[PDB]
Structure formats: C-alpha cells, structure tokens
C-alpha cells in the first residue's frame, strides 16, 4: 500500500513511500521519451515569475496523447504500467493491434494487459475513449477536454473522477473533482474510470531532502523579510501582521475572490466550487 520505515534515523520514521509493486519495470519507449530541462521559475527574461523552483533530479517527458481520436475505431492492448516522474498519476503503455505504440494515462484498477477500445462505438469499460454523450448518466470518468480534439485537461491528478450528471442539450453537465458543475460539449471525449495512484495523496514526505528531490526550493514567510523586501516584514519580535494578510504584491490573501469577473466561461458553470 505504502512502504514505511523503522525509526533507525530521526527522519526515517514518518517517512513513507509509494507502492510500485505493480509497476511493469521498463525504461520508457525511446521514440516517446523527450527531454525536459528545468526552469528555475525564471522565464525568457530571466526573472523568477513562478517563485521557489530549484533542481531535484533529472526528468524526461513521455508524450501522452490525450485526444485518443487519432486512433479511435480500433483497439490496443495494455502492455505495461511504468512510472512517470512528471505526473501525479501512473501511466500505461498502449500496443495498438495495428503496429503503432502510444502512451496513455493509467486509471484505477486497469490490470496489465486488458485490451481496451476507443471510439463512440466503445464499451463503458475502464480505459475506453468515449464521447461524453454516449456515457451513462452518473458514470465515473476522467481526462475531459474543453472541446473536441483539443486535449484532455480535466481529471488528471491522482484518483480523480469527473462525474456525468447527465445530458441536456449538446452540452453535458459534469461533476468536476473540485466540487463544480460544468457544461461540456457532448462531442467532447472521455476515458472511463477514476485516475488511480490514489494512494498518492497520503505519502508522508518525511525530510527536507524529499522536498528537494521533487525540486521545490524552501518556501519563505514574508514575516522573515524586511520592509524593503516584502509587506509583512519588519517588527521587533515574532510579530503579528498589523495589516490584513496580503501577498508580496499586497493583493490580499485569505478570502479574496480573484477570478476575472466578466468571462466566456461564466455561461458553462452552473454552480461554484464551494
């Protein structure tokens, strides 16, 4: 489920580790293994836009086509469930009966070797490419596009499930994992099931290092900084605030709606993530 550790070192107690005992051990396919360099958070101007990014371990991209519509109407069989360091989830290896291999995202349960399909003409099985309209009411799914062909941008993190509330017009209502209700153009695609990994959410990190190894340079209380540096700075003691909680940029954190008030999305969200 998760490996644990006897307390032989101080930090080797709470520490916890994944269960990769179901990972088809394999060096990911060569003609699918692009090269990701890291970006300190600096952009093409060399200034840290994102903030607090740094190093960790060398990583590579595995192309994971999300629009299965490039090969729907035929099926492939699962070949392996290797380990991507860039995703919160696990990924799986597709052997299309007609030669071409691909990589797709791996869902919850889907045992190594199950032969899965793609096309509107597909059984609600785990791992099928299926349009959202042909999906049963109340069914469990992930990997949802905001338009046909675009690419699956919904339900991708570990153990996530967008849930078909049901059809309507040509826009199917949907339950986002955040707790939101979204209209989706029924010619949008889907992949049946929960994401899996699932266990992820729970692995205790355990020590500084473990943060570093995923490349998350140490985070910083502005309450450390000085006036010159950032808002909450100054003081003579472990000091409070003296103003309302606020980002470095002074635009309040803690209870301040930040979404842009006018938008085109505003007539596709029937409810709010509350």
Partner RNA sequence: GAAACGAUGACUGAAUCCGCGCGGACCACCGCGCAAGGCUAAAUACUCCCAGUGACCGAUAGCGCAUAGUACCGUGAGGG
Partner RNA sequence: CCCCCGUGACAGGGGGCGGAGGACCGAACCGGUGCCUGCUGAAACAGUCUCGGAUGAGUUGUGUUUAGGAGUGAAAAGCU
Partner RNA sequence: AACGAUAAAAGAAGUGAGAAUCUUCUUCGCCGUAAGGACAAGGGUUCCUGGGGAAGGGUCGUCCGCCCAGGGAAAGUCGGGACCUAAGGUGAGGCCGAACGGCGCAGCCGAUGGACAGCAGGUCAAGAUUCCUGCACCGAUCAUGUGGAGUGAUGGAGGGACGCAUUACGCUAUCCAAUGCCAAGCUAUGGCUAUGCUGGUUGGUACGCUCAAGGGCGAUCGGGUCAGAAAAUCUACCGGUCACAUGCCUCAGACGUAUCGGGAGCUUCCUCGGAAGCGAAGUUGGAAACGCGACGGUGCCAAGAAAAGCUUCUAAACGUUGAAACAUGAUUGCCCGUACCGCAAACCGACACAGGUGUCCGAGUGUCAAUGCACUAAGGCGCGCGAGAGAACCCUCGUUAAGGAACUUUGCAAUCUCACCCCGUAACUUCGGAAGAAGGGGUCCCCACGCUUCGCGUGGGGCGCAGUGAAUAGGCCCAGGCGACUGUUUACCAAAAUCACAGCACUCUGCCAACACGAACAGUGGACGUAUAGGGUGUGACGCCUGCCCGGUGCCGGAAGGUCAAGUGGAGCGGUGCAAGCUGCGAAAUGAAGCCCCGGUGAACGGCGGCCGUAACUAUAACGGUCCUAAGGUAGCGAAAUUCCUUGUCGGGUAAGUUCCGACCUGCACGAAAGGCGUAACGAUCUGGGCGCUGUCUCAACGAGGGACUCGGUGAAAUUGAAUUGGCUGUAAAGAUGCGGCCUACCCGUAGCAGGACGAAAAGACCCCGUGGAGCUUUACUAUAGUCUGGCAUUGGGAU
Contact indicator for 91, 33 with CB cutoff of 8 Å: no
Q: Which of 31, 242, 261, 274 binds Mg ion (CB under 5 A)?
A: 242
Those residues whose C-beta lies under 8 Å from the C-beta of residue 258, and which sit 6 or more positions away, are: 251
Nearest distance, CB of residue 126 and RNA, angstroms: 16
Nearest distance, CB of residue 221 and Mg ion, angstroms: 8
What are the Cα distances from residue 237, in Å, to 113, 220, 233, 234? 62, 17, 11, 9
Those residues whose C-beta lies under 8 Å from the C-beta of residue 164, and which sit 6 or more positions away, are: 132, 135, 136, 137, 138, 139, 141, 172, 173, 174, 175
Binders of RNA among residues 197 to 236 (CB under 7 A) are 197-201, 204-214, 216-232, 234
Q: Which of 7, 109, 136, 149 binds RNA (CB under 7 A)?
A: 7
Which entry of RNA, Mg ion, none binds 218, CB below 5 to 8 A by partner kind? Answer: RNA
Nearest distance, CB of residue 158 and Mg ion, angstroms: 21
Which entry of RNA, Mg ion, none binds 217, CB below 5 to 8 A by partner kind? Answer: RNA
Angle at 60 between CA 67 and CA 90, to 5 degrees: 55
115 binds RNA per the rule CB under 7 A: no
User: Which CB sits closer to RNA, 95 or 125?
Assistant: 95
Report the C-alpha gap between 231 and 246 in whole angstroms: 7
User: Which CB sits closer to RNA, 85 or 124?
Assistant: 85
Phi, psi torsion values for 80, nearest 5 degrees: -170, 160
Tokens of 224: 């450390």
Size of the site for RNA (CB under 7 A): 142
163 binds RNA per the rule CB under 7 A: no
10 binds Mg ion per the rule CB under 5 A: no
Which entry of Mg ion, RNA, none binds 213, CB below 5 to 8 A by partner kind? Answer: RNA
Build a one-symbol-per-residue string for 121-140: x at contacts with RNA by CB under 7 A, - elsewhere. --------------------
Report the C-alpha gap between 274 and 256 in whole angstroms: 14
DSSP label at 212?
H
| 230 CA to centre of own chain | 31
Question: What does the binding site for Mg ion look like in residue numbers (CB under 5 A)?
Answer: 219, 234, 242
């Amino acid at each position: 489920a998760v490996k644990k550790y006897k307390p032989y070192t101080p930090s080797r107690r709470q520490m916890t580790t994944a269960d990769f005992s179901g990972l088809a051990k394999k060096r990911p396919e060569k003609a699918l293994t692009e090269a990701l360099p890291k970006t300190g958070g600096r952009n093409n101007r060399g200034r840290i836009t994102s903030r607090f990014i740094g190093g960790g371990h060398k990583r590579l991209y595995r192309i994971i086509d999300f629009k299965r519509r490039d090969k729907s109407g035929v099926n492939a069989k699962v070949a392996a469930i290797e380990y991507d360091p860039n995703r919160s989830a696990r990924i799986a290896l597709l052997h299309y009966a007609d030669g071409e291999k691909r990589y797709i995202l791996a869902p919850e349960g889907l045992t190594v070797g199950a032969t899965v399909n793609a096309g509107p003409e597909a059984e609600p099985k785990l791992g099928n490419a299926l349009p959202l309209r042909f999906v049963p009411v109340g069914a469990v799914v992930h990997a949802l596009e905001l338009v046909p062909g675009k690419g699956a941008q919904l339900a991708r993190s570990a153990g996530t499930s967008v849930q078909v509330q049901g059809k309507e017009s040509d826009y199917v209502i949907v339950r986002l994992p955040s707790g939101e209700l979204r209209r989706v153009h029924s010619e949008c695609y889907a992949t049946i099931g929960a994401v899996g990994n699932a266990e992820h959410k729970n692995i205790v990190l355990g020590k500084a290092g473990r943060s570093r190894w995923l490349g998350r340079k140490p985070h910083q209380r502005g309450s450390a900084m000085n006036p010159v540096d950032h808002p909450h700075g100054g003081g003579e003691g472990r000091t409070g605030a003296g103003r309302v909680p606020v980002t470095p940029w002074g635009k309040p954190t803690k209870g301040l709606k930040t979404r842009r008030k006018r938008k085109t999305s505003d007539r596709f969200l029937v409810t709010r993530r509350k």
